[PDB]
Amino acid sequence: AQCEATIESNDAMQYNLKEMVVDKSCKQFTVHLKHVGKMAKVAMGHNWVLTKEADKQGVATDGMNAGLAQDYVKAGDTRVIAHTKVIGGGESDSVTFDVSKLTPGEAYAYFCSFPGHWAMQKGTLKLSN
Ligand SMILES: [Cu+2]
């Protein structure tokens, strides 16, 4: 709603939103990730990671390599515009980020970097009015 959105992840390694639009009057945007499945975070944990579409595989590989204690995102990875924590079934997490980190026109990729999820669990984020 307004300068925020909610996205659901389930036990099928899917996000319910394939596209998110950040309104141009927004200086901050907030994403609330909900894991509406029942599986454990070691089994089917999920997060939400935002990168320029170019850096998606790089971030997903380094992220898989950072472990669960780093929420599968390489610590201080400059390519990650924002990310939630890794959560398990029945949980939620939120992240707010600065919209000046994004450029109009330019398309961004958001995905889940939990092992093996990036390929499938993905969507596009764009800035518009
Ligand atoms: Cu996932």
Experimentally, the structure was elucidated by: X-ray
Q: What's the fold here for domain 1-129?
A: Immunoglobulin-like (2.60.40)
| CB neighbour burial string for 5-42, b if at least 16 within 10 angstroms, e if fewer | bebbbbeebbbeeeebebeeebeebbbbbbbebebebe
10 Å Cβ neighbour count for 68?
A: 12
Q: Give the max Cα distance, the chain.
A: 39
User: Residue with structure tokens 């599968």?
Assistant: 72
Q: Residue 17 contacts by C-beta under 8 Å, 6 or more apart in sequence?
A: 5, 7, 8, 123
Residue 41 CA to ligand 1 centre (angstroms): 9
Compute the distance from residue 24 Cα to the ligand 1 centre, in Å. 28
Instruction: Detail the DSSP E strand segments found in 1-129.
Output: 4-9, 19-23, 28-35, 49-52, 82-83, 92-98, 108-111, 122-128
Q: How far apart are the C-alpha atoms of 1 and 70, rounded to whole Å?
A: 29
Structure tokens at 43: 């089994």
Q: CA–CA separation, 15 vs 8, rounded Å?
A: 6
For the chain, domain boundaries: 1-129
Cα-to-centroid distance, 118 and ligand 1 (Å): 7
CA of 36 to the centre of ligand 1 (A): 12
Q: For this experimental structure, what is the resolution in angstroms? A: 1.9
Cβ–Cβ contacts within 10 Å for residue 105, how many?
A: 8
